[PDB]
Amino acid sequence: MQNEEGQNVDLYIPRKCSATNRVITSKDHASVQLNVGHLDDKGLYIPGSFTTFALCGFIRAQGDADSALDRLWQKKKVEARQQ
Amino acid sequence: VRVSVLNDALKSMYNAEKRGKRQVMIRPSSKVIIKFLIVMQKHGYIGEFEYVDDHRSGKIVVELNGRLNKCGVISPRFDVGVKEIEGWTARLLPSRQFGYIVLTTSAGIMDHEEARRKNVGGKVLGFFY
Amino acid sequence: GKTRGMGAGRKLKSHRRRQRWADKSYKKSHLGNEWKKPFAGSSHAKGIVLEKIGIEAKQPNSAIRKCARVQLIKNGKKIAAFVPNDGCLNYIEENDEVLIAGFGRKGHAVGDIPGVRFKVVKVSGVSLLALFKEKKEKPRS
Amino acid sequence: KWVPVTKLGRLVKDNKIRSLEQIYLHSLPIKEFQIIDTLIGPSLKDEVMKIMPVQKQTRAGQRTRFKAFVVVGDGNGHVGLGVKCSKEVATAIRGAIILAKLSVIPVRRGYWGNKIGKPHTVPCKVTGKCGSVTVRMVPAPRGAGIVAARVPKKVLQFAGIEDVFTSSRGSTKTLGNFVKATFDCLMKTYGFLTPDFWKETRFTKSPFQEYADILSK
Amino acid sequence: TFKRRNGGRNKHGRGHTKFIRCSNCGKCCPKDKAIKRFLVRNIVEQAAVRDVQEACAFETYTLPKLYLKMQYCVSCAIHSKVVRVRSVTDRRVREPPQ
Amino acid sequence: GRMHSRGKGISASALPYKRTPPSWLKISAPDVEDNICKFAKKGLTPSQIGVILRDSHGIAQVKSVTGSKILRILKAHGLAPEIPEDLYHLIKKAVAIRKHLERNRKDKDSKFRLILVESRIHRLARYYKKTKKLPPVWKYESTTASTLV
RNA sequence: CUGGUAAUUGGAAUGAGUACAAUCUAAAUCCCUUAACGAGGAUCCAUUGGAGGGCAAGUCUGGUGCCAGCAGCCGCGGUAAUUCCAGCUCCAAUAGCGUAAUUUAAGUUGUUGCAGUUAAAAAGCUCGUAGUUGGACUUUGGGAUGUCCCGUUACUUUGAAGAAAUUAGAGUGCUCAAAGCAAGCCUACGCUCUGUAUACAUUAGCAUGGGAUAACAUUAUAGGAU
RNA sequence: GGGCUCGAAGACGAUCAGAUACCGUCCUAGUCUCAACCAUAAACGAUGCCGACCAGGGAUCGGCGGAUGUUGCUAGGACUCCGCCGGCACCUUAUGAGAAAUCAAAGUUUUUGGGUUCCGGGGGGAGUAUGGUCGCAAGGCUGAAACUUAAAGGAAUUGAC
RNA sequence: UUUUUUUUUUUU
Ligand SMILES: [K+]
Ligand SMILES: [K+]
Ligand SMILES: [K+]
Ligand SMILES: [K+]
Ligand SMILES: [K+]
Ligand SMILES: [K+]
Ligand SMILES: [K+]
Ligand SMILES: [K+]
Ligand SMILES: [K+]
Ligand SMILES: [K+]
Ligand SMILES: [K+]
Ligand SMILES: [K+]
Ligand SMILES: [K+]
Ligand SMILES: [K+]
Ligand SMILES: [K+]
Ligand SMILES: [K+]
Ligand SMILES: [K+]
Ligand SMILES: [Mg+2]
Ligand SMILES: [Mg+2]
Ligand SMILES: [Mg+2]
Ligand SMILES: [Mg+2]
Ligand SMILES: [Mg+2]
Ligand SMILES: [Mg+2]
Ligand SMILES: [Mg+2]
Ligand SMILES: [Mg+2]
Ligand SMILES: [Mg+2]
Ligand SMILES: [Mg+2]
Ligand SMILES: [Mg+2]
Ligand SMILES: [Mg+2]
Ligand SMILES: [Mg+2]
Ligand SMILES: [Mg+2]
Ligand SMILES: [Mg+2]
Ligand SMILES: [Mg+2]
Ligand SMILES: [Mg+2]
Ligand SMILES: [Mg+2]
Ligand SMILES: [Mg+2]
Ligand SMILES: [Zn+2]
């Protein structure tokens, strides 16, 4: 949200679920954030480089977090040349 | 029996979006349904949808962005003049900054903002946001 | 569920009209029974004192509530009227002329007094409040 | 003085975390009220809303305890609610103040129409429900004021909302449920996905990951 | 308040079930509701088995068995202790006792 | 669901997406019409004709080869019955039920079923009167229903 | 220096009243104006309801003792009464305030917008005429540039017309205000053509553009179109 | 017409302070059937019907498709496995609802609108009075008011019993 | 499975 002038007005921008697109609220203590490390040509972890995924409590309580994260990681690894 | 195919389509999309599904199925298809979906897609509330031919009313598969809070039908289709749009939006939409009411006017099926722009009235079909 | 047909306005209107009678307030003001009641739809009524009566207070209280039996002049109906304030029954006599008002709950008993819906406002053209405060004096005749 | 027992408390005491928005972003639980006192303590105000006695029947009579309802807020988008039951009124009030501090949440404020100046009302239509009590907030134009009962009005004032329309259904004379429904309605402000939030989220390191080395000792 | 999902009986997709007579008091009770027990015991009690066997008039003989189906009303079943009052969670268990 | 019961069965035919005749079929449209007319002359209803064609002559759908429905072909040749086949069968069922009830006064189930069947007959007859498949004077009467068939 | 209190002191101010006079007025009266009078306990003396909670205000003092009484409701009173009868003090409004059909609150009549398992509630079951409701399908696109190419109704847009008064609303110092439709410059033997706008108005009727969504009627024994 | 059994009413025997009862004994009407009435039940899932969507799982009834190996049997039937449709239900779960108890429909409801019927509006008076209508009768259906009253009532918690 | 009836009004 912005003013007519163009100033940012919101207190903060909440994160969104990587799978459901839902807004992750401040009291959502079932939500998690995961970093998947990247590997070089020799299968060694490159420090500081990873793909970040966030899951809201709703999807994790449903048990669908595993498959959603698997699909998201597969797509992101295909895009990022991590194989 | 089936009375409003548009209601069934919108309710299926709403339930699927709440469940988090990436795709939903609409059966039977209709040109009113297609126009509603095109209005929704114009504003980024849905992805690509595909019509399936079966030598019958048809079928539609809709991609869901995850941006749809709620889409609904209004029944019966009340008469809405150009001056009643403000009241209808106040009744139905969460805010004046976003959200759309779909009307069927003699100029075609369109959202309420376009109806205000063209100064055309008609009948209310539904809403989405 | 409700009827929603665009051509079903008549049914909705008729259903509301029929269901309004289940409302007690609506039925009271639309049955035309207020004219058969002692006041006949008036805020006040004059009457003649027939007899002083003591009414026992309801549980858990214990008292003798002083009331008067009054016959309304305009229709001859007999009612019980409470006489408020300490010792104000001494200002009432048989065959006296009294102005009667409602007890404040629109035809229902108030407090621990059973079956009394009226109170005395004036006696012999002088308000009971003035008599209680000695502002005025009850006419001798 | 204060000896933090949590990673968040250690970071807040070490000045690594300086704004409540940093904690709100990652949805981290807050289990020490000293965190809130350090972050937004100076601007916070408290108010006891109700002292409610409750009784438990026992073999030798009724054991009475008192329920304290406390509301805290900075009047600038932060508000918290606290409920505590104790034998003594003072102990209950202290516990309620602590709990209200621990439960402070961010409140999103938007514009009714034209977006000039600071936000003045709720961004959208929101509804809260506790027990049978349902509280609905509707955006209102500038100058409309807070159209609400005294309990919701106080809760909204502590949240910094300038004008809003409200409606309530159910047993609003149940003060606890009324205030809890108002609080739930206010919390739901930041959960509604609007078109202005359609932008892709760009994640940032969590405080436990950003300051992992410091917390490693 | 409703305390049993089945309403204390075993009727589903059915209008009426004919009743039985309680084997103890003779009270009428729907068959699907009556507490039914099947008792299979030796005619000769274990105490008298040896004495009866010693007096057998044949080289070999297997003692018969007594078969009885008992159908109780709820009151008699509780009073006779065929069934007992259980806790709210324990009365949802349907398996027979081990 | 069912009109006069609580059944919710969904068993039905599944017409293929292909509307053209199969390649192996070689019969011609006029030939198919000739066989249909012959069967109708022999006293077969359109449903029976279609069943026979499908089961014996390899004609899955008459419309695929002829381009028109069986009843349309029969009408074009002046062979359609005076009353439609489904209404005829409903009336036949009603007549049978009434004949059975004549000797069974205690059979209240048969009375219930007769009420249902006659309601169906009347609704169908009203529809056929609306579409001018029956004369406006047509009326179903239980007393002389047996004459109609 | 800054504030609050005092039937302590001190002089100032003034209208309620009174009254020449003028003014007002058809004639009177009132108002406005104004000679002479008119305030210290400024006796030129403010009342109506309350003080447990809802709901602002006393665990003060005396009397009564489930009596008398209060109390819209919950409750007070049985010998230590914040609740009655009184004194003092305090609170609310204030030249006003108390008491005895109708609106809101009432989403407790629910079209927007209520309920029907156990709170009040779905007919024992099915059929069924009025009523209400009723699946899909018939011309889309580009090129260009509002324009060119390939039966009856509902509904909506626009226009006319649709008494004033009342409502909303523009202007205007009746000393202000409720009002009213006045009025303003300058003292010119006058002027501002002074102003006395504008909006709103269910349904139904009249005229007009649109042809999405709907309703009724029609279709093939060709007796069809040309 | 039947009338075995049981058994309103009734009669006795007990128990009891009494016992017009509970317990025992004998029994009329009834209980059964036919013809004609009656139309009410906690007639209950205390939960209208049609249609759409909506989690998982194992059982089971009917039909059907496929696979496979046996049968003291006559391609079939019985059994085994995998599926589809329809049905009576059950178990787990909340991302749902609810005042909760609970409910996979009592969900998709202040983010309120698929179609349609019935029906409630604090507690009593009262399912009463009156009128009408049906019934041989018993009674059924339709169905008020005067007046009275601050609670009655639902779910759940602790204690006491 | 013999028999077991009753506890003035208000208030704590
Ligand atoms: K008493
Ligand atoms: K008392
Ligand atoms: K039950
Ligand atoms: K049982
Ligand atoms: K049916
Ligand atoms: K079938
Ligand atoms: K008060
Ligand atoms: K004394
Ligand atoms: K005293
Ligand atoms: K008081
Ligand atoms: K007999
Ligand atoms: K007997
Ligand atoms: K006894
Ligand atoms: K009967
Ligand atoms: K039941
Ligand atoms: K099954
Ligand atoms: K008392
Ligand atoms: Mg119980
Ligand atoms: Mg039954
Ligand atoms: Mg039907
Ligand atoms: Mg079906
Ligand atoms: Mg107070
Ligand atoms: Mg005293
Ligand atoms: Mg006093
Ligand atoms: Mg209600
Ligand atoms: Mg009950
Ligand atoms: Mg009930
Ligand atoms: Mg019922
Ligand atoms: Mg009927
Ligand atoms: Mg349609
Ligand atoms: Mg006998
Ligand atoms: Mg009989
Ligand atoms: Mg009944
Ligand atoms: Mg099977
Ligand atoms: Mg009532
Ligand atoms: Mg006794
Ligand atoms: Zn028994």
Beta strands in D59-163 (DSSP E): 61-73, 78-86, 105-106, 126-130, 133-139, 146-147
Helical residues (DSSP H) of C55-125, grouped into ranges? none
Query: C-alpha angle D100/D104/D107, rounded to 5°?
Result: 135
Interface check D193 vs A, CB under 8 A: yes
CA–CA min distance B55, chain F (Å): 7
Q: What is the resolution of this structure in A?
A: 2.4
Is residue C60 reached through a cis peptide bond, with omega within 30 degrees of 0 on the bond before it?
A: yes
Is the Cβ pair F15, B54 closer than 8 Å? no
Buried b / exposed e over E37-49, threshold 16 CB at 10 Å, is eeeeeeebeeeee
Is the Cβ pair A23, D191 closer than 8 Å? yes
Whole-angstrom distance, CA of residue E73 vs CA of residue E55: 41
Helical residues (DSSP H) of chain C, grouped into ranges? 9-19, 24-28, 128-132
Q: CA torsion A34→A35→A36→A42, rounded to 10°? A: -160
Tokens of F73: 């072909």
Contacts of range D95-100, beta carbons closer than 8 Å, 24 or more positions apart:
D95/D68, D96/D48, D96/D68, D96/D69, D96/D70, D97/D46, D97/D70, D97/D72, D98/D33, D99/D70, D100/D46, D100/D70, D100/D71, D100/D72
Count, residues in chain E: 98
CB B79 within 8 A of CB B72: no
HSE (CB half, 13 Å, CA atoms) of D191? 17
In chain A, the largest separation of any two C-alpha atoms, in whole Å, equals 52
CB B28 within 8 A of CB B5: yes
Tokens of F116: 């249902």
Q: Provide Rg for chain D, Cα atoms.
A: 19
What residue of A is the nearest CA neighbor of D24?
A26
Contacts of B112 (CB under 8 A, 6+ apart): B85, B88, B89, B100, B101, B102, B103
Q: Give the nearest nucleotide to E6, CA to C1'.
A: H45
Contacts of B1 (CB under 8 A, 6+ apart): none
Is residue B76 reached through a cis peptide bond, with omega within 30 degrees of 0 on the bond before it?
A: yes
Using a CB-CB cut-off of 8 Å, the residues of chain A touching B65 are 21
Name the one residue in this structure whose structure tokens are 């929101």.
D126
Looking at strand I, which nucleotides approach a protein CB closer than 7 A? 1, 9-11
Tokens of C85: 């304030």
Tokens of C77: 């109906």
Count, residues in chain F: 149
Q: Give the nearest nucleotide to E14, CA to C1'.
A: H88
Residue A15: φ, ψ to 5°: -70, 165
Check if residue E25 sits with its Cβ under 7 angstroms from strand I. yes
Neighbours of E23 (CB within 10 A): 17
Contacts of A10 (CB under 8 A, 6+ apart): A1, D108
CB D107 within 8 A of CB D77: yes
CB D67 within 8 A of CB D91: no
CB B111 within 8 A of CB B105: no
CB D160 within 8 A of CB D98: no
Neighbours of C43 (CB within 10 A): 7
Residue D137: φ, ψ to 5°: -115, 130
Closest Cα to residue B123, out of B71, B72, B80?
Answer: B80
- Which residues hold their Cβ within 5 A of ligand 3, which is an ion? E 7
DSSP F59-122: -S-HHHHHSS-HHHHHHHTT-S-SS-HHHHHHHHHHHHHHHHHHH-TT-HHHHHHHHHHHHHHH
Closest Cα to residue B62, out of B23, B11, B30?
Answer: B23
DSSP D13-69: HTTS---HHHHHHHT-----HHHHHHHHTTT-EEEEEEEEEEEEEETTEEEEEEEEE
Residue F46, Cβ density class (10 Å: 0-12 exposed, 13-18 middle, ≥19 buried): buried
Closest Cα to residue D109, out of D162, D147, D71, D158?
Answer: D162
3 state SS of A50? strand
Identity at D83, one-letter amino acid code: V
Tokens of E39: 């008792």
Neighbours of D108 (CB within 10 A): 24
- The distance of Cα B106 from the centroid of its chain, to the nearest Å, equals 17
Looking at strand G, which nucleotides approach a protein CB closer than 7 A? 49, 66-78, 84-85, 99-103, 107-112, 114, 116-118, 122, 126-129, 131-138, 155-158, 209-214, 219, 221-222
Neighbours of F51 (CB within 10 A): 12
Interface check F17 vs B, CB under 8 A: yes
CB F118 within 8 A of CB F138: no
**Looking at the partner chain, which of B67, B94, B96 has a beta carbon nearest the beta carbon of D198?**
B67
CB B15 within 8 A of CB B26: no
Whole-angstrom distance, CA of residue D78 vs CA of residue D186: 10
Neighbours of D70 (CB within 10 A): 25
Q: Give the nearest nucleotide to F78, CA to C1'.
A: G221
Tokens of D150: 């005294």
- The distance of Cα D183 from the centroid of its chain, to the nearest Å, equals 7
Whole-angstrom distance, CA of residue B84 vs CA of residue B80: 6
Residue D174 CA and nucleotide G14 C1' are separated, in Å, by 59
How are beta strands B23-26 and B59-63 bridged, if at all?
Answer: antiparallel
The domain limits of chain C are 1-141
What are residue D103's DSSP bridge partners? none
Strands laid side by side in the B23-26 sheet: B23-26, B59-63, B49-52
CB E73 within 8 A of CB E29: yes
The domain limits of chain F are 26-80, 81-149
Residue C86, Cβ density class (10 Å: 0-12 exposed, 13-18 middle, ≥19 buried): exposed
Check if residue C115 sits with its Cβ under 7 angstroms from strand G. no
CB C122 within 8 A of CB C128: yes
Using a CB-CB cut-off of 8 Å, the residues of chain D touching A16 are 193, 197, 201
3 state SS of D95? helix
Whole-angstrom distance, CA of residue D13 vs CA of residue D39: 10
CB D99 within 8 A of CB D110: no
Q: Which helix (H) or strand (E) holds D155?
A: helix D150-159
Using a CB-CB cut-off of 8 Å, the residues of chain C touching B75 are 4
Whole-angstrom distance, CA of residue B13 vs CA of residue B7: 10
Helical residues (DSSP H) of B20-111, grouped into ranges? 31-42, 85-92
Tokens of F82: 């005076």
Whole-angstrom distance, CA of residue F49 vs CA of residue F68: 14
Residue D38: φ, ψ to 5°: -70, -40
Interface check B123 vs A, CB under 8 A: no
Is the Cβ pair A19, B65 closer than 8 Å? no
Q: Measuring CA to CA, how many Å separate B121 from each of B73, B74, B106, F76?
A: 18, 16, 8, 49
CB D139 within 8 A of CB D156: no
Calculate how far, in angstroms, residue B76's C-alpha sits from the geometric centre of ligand 19: 41
Crossing angle of the two packed helices F108-130 and F85-103, in degrees rounded to 10: 160
What are residue C123's DSSP bridge partners? C98, C126
3 state SS of E38? strand
Closest Cα to residue D55, out of D70, D46, D67, D45?
Answer: D67
Beta strands in E1-98 (DSSP E): 19-21, 28-30, 35-42, 65-72
Count, residues in chain D: 217
Q: Is C73 left (phi over 0), alpha (psi -120 to 50) or beta?
A: alpha
Interface check F19 vs B, CB under 8 A: yes
Q: CA torsion B33→B38→B44→B48, rounded to 10°? A: 80
Calculate how far, in angstroms, residue E73's C-alpha sits from the geometric centre of ligand 13: 29
Whole-angstrom distance, CA of residue F35 vs CA of residue A8: 82
Query: C-alpha angle D178/D184/D190, rounded to 5°?
Result: 150
Whole-angstrom distance, CA of residue D155 vs CA of residue D168: 14
Check if residue C141 sits with its Cβ under 7 angstroms from strand G. no
Calculate how far, in angstroms, residue C111's C-alpha sits from the geometric centre of ligand 10: 15
Closest Cα to residue F63, out of F24, F45, F36?
Answer: F36
Looking at strand H, which nucleotides approach a protein CB closer than 7 A? 34-36, 45-46, 48-55, 85-92, 94-95, 98-103, 106-122, 145-150, 154-156, 158-160
Q: Measuring CA to CA, how many Å separate D188 from each of A32, A36, A55?
A: 20, 31, 19
B residues 6-25 lying closer than 8 A (beta carbon) to A: 20
The DSSP call for residue E79 is: H
Closest ligand (CA of F2): 5
Identity at B90, one-letter amino acid code: A
Query: C-alpha angle E59/E61/E62, rounded to 5°?
Result: 155
CB D97 within 8 A of CB D37: no
Q: Which helix (H) or strand (E) holds B83?
A: none
Crossing angle of the two packed helices D89-102 and D33-40, in degrees rounded to 10: 70
Whole-angstrom distance, CA of residue B113 vs CA of residue B104: 13
Q: What is the count of residue pairs from B and D with beta carbons less than 8 Å apart?
A: 24
